[PDB]
Structures are given as structure tokens and as C-alpha cells.
Amino acid sequence: MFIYYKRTKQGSTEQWFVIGGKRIYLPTMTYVNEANDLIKRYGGNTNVTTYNHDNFGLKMMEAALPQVKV
């Protein structure tokens, strides 16, 4: 599990949480805090990387990790 940042085409920065082979968009700072709590408890990765929307690394992550909504 880890969090990454996504710089959108419209300019905003989104925080996304990878868990269980899935991707979750974090809509509020309270969701961000709880995701970081999960990372701390379950040995997740504390790396934070910001990806431009067109970055190939981001694209491969979005292809392999289905989005789920909370």
C-alpha cells in the first residue's frame, strides 16, 4: 500500500491510495489521514511521488490497479 499524487490535465493535484491491487481516490484530508494510518499499521510504503497525468509510470499503475470508490 502507498499513496501517490496525480497532476490532472485541468491542473489540480489528486491524492490516490493503492491497496489490495486497487486504486482509491482520496476525496478529503480525513481520508488521506486514515490511509496514512493504514500504511503505518500494515508495513506500507511511505514514498510520495507526484505523477503528471500523461506519465507512463502512472499510466501503467492505472492500467493494472482497478479504481474502487469509497
Q: Which is nearer to a copy of itself, 13 or 45 (CB)?
A: 45
Among 12, 22, 50, 52, binds a copy of itself (CB under 8 A): 22
CA distance 57 to 5: 12
Position 68 contacts a copy of itself (CB under 8 A): yes
Position 38 contacts a copy of itself (CB under 8 A): yes
Position 56 contacts a copy of itself (CB under 8 A): yes
The SS3 assignment for 62 reads helix
CA distances (Å), 23 to each of 12, 46, in order?
Answer: 18, 16
Give the sheet arrangement for strand 13-19, strand by strand.
Answer: 22-25, 13-19, 2-7, 50-52
Q: Which is nearer to a copy of itself, 8 or 60 (CB)?
A: 60
Position 47 contacts a copy of itself (CB under 8 A): yes
